[PDB]
Design a protein around this nucleic acid. Structure first.
Lengths: 63, 108, 78, 176
RNA sequence: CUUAUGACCUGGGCUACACACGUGCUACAAUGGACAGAACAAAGGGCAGCGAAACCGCGAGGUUAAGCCAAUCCCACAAAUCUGUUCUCAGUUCGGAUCGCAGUCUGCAACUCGACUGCGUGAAGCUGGAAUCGCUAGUAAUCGCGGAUCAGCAUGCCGCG
């Protein structure tokens, strides 16, 4: 580190909207996260609990 | 922000959530009424829980990251499926039976 | 587009279900480009009149809800 | 830091049992993350790189380096000597800090996300990623960004084959 | 010609599309737009027809259905207008073009090739060159409303205030 030419680096915790924690550093001090890796559905393993999904080819005129 | 896309911050929330891809005015207003968060708010100075309880309802309806691709897949299905409608889509000619003599500069 | 069922002409039906009942193989003739496709004619082939010539076309699985007139372009271009 | 603790505790033992290494320090290790800015400059405006530099010093923890063009090519009207693109390498606790931000906040915040590419490898255990948006961590002041050119992400490991890097990056946390 | 320039039948075409011309419609906005409320016309049509109220459906419409061969009943809640709230001058709460999805009606049948509804998407266009037209007051300009043609289809026409 040539001092002065780098911005300040310090501990900066994470608050996701779901309330998950992460012991993080950043140039800022605090980050609000709308969606984390435990609730965004692709990193929920595979669509664990975030889904409104499905697709069929339905051919139904029986009413 | 809300669902990926940011929001113009100084306007009313009912006008502001129509900038996202997937809800118009009428569809926005009724989910906003179900949200129950006033429906006459400036989005610049609302609070976080009334900000966040709409996330779950827009998750169970559908927006750009899914509508864009499903309409794309359906329309290329219509393309390579061999339809007259599909080949009109391919060639840029109008689809809803409009006359090509005098108009349709909106396409081509 | 009405919920009393899609509309076809009966005589072409009778031959095509007896066709797919006993022997799926060969082609079926028509002059009527009007019948809505039913999802139980997958895999066959139909010679549809375009107004000038009978044209064969193959029906796949996703060919549902349309009519057989969608695939015999009556007018040509450059 | 947390990732370093997990890598020391569980990641490296699991894979060293999995590849049956005789010497336990034959373990593949992620060596350098380098972030390379590229501007389509060609003498259009000097301030594009003069904005990207302090944008990237906010994205990372320190100042980047303005890359030097090697030779002139007039196919872009690129005269040799005027600056194009920026670069910064990250290592130490800094690399784990950045990968932390990546996995935790960044990729879930992309406008559309499917799984990361299956075979972006070099063939010799290195990986390259291309992202289109500057919106990596949400406390960039998003109103100040004007141009939309995203970032180039290069992770370098001691992996000799593609398979070891492919397997280790899974427990790092890259979706596929 | 009667072994077709005459008949019959099905399907297609009369709706195509690189361009141009004309006639119209609609916009480019705050003398506005959205939302609520308050009103105020004439002139016509209706029996294989108009179809009330009520109920269902967000809506197109659907259901049982009252009355009327009509100065009784129905079509049929006129709109512009006025009052109030909001929007705060932007390609926009302007403009809605074109598309995807789901439907409504009619008709044997809505693909070529109908109209309408709920959706989502949202185009160009921020007053238009050379030119050029109509119009002497209930006129121009705007505002709706009927009728014919008619299974369904009108920005066209005719007429009404």
């Amino acid at each position: 580190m040539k001092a002065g030419i780098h911005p300040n680096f310090k501990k900066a915790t994470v608050k996701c909207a779901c309330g998950n924690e992460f012991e993080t550093g950043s140039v800022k001090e605090e980050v609000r996260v709308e969606i984390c890796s435990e609730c965004h559905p692709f990193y929920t393993g595979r669509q664990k609990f975030a889904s409104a999904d499905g697709r069929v080819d339905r051919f139904n005129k029986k009413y | 922000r809300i669902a990926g896309v940011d929001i113009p911050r100084d306007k009313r929330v009912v006008i502001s959530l129509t900038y996202i891809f997937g809800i118009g005015r009428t569809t926005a207003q009724q989910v906003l009424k179900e949200a129950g968060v006033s429906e006459d708010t400036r989005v610049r100075d609302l609070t976080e829980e009334e900000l966040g309880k709409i996330r779950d309802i827009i998750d169970k309806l559908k927006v750009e990251g899914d509508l864009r691709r499903e309409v794309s897949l359906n329309i290329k299905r219509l393309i390579e499926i061999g339809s007259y409608r599909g080949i009109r889509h391919r060639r840029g000619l109008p689809v809803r039976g409009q006359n090509s003599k005098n108009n349709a500069r909106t396409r081509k | 587009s009405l919920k009393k069922g899609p509309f076809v002409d009966g005589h072409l039906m009778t031959k095509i279900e007896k066709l797919n009942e006993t022997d799926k193989k060969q082609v079926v003739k028509t002059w009527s480009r009007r019948s809505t496709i039913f999802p139980q004619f997958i895999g066959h082939t139909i010679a549809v009149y375009d107004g000038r010539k009978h044209v064969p076309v193959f029906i796949s699985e996703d060919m549902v809800g349309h009519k057989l007139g969608e695939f015999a372009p009556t007018r040509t271009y450059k | 830091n947390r990732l370093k603790e997990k890598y020391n505790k569980e990641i490296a033992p699991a894979l060293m049992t999995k590849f049956n290494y005789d010497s336990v320090m034959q373990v593949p290790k992620i060596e350098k993350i380098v972030i390379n800015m590229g501007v389509g400059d060609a003498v259009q405006n000097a301030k594009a790189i003069d904005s990207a530099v302090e944008e990237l010093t906010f994205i990372a923890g320190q100042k980047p380096v303005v890359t030097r063009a090697k030779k002139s090519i007039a196919g872009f009207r690129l005269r040799e000597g005027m600056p194009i693109g920026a670069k910064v390498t990250l290592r130490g606790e800094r690399m784990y800090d950045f990968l932390d931000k990546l996995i935790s906040v960044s990729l879930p915040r992309v406008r559309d996300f499917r799984g990361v590419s299956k075979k972006s490898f070099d063939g010799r255990g290195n990986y390259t990623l291309g992202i289109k948006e500057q919106l990596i961590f949400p406390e960039i002041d998003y109103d100040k960004v004007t141009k939309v050119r995203g970032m180039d992400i290069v992770i370098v490991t001691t992996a000799n084959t593609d398979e070891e890097a492919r397997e280790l990056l899974t427990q790092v946390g890259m979706p596929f």
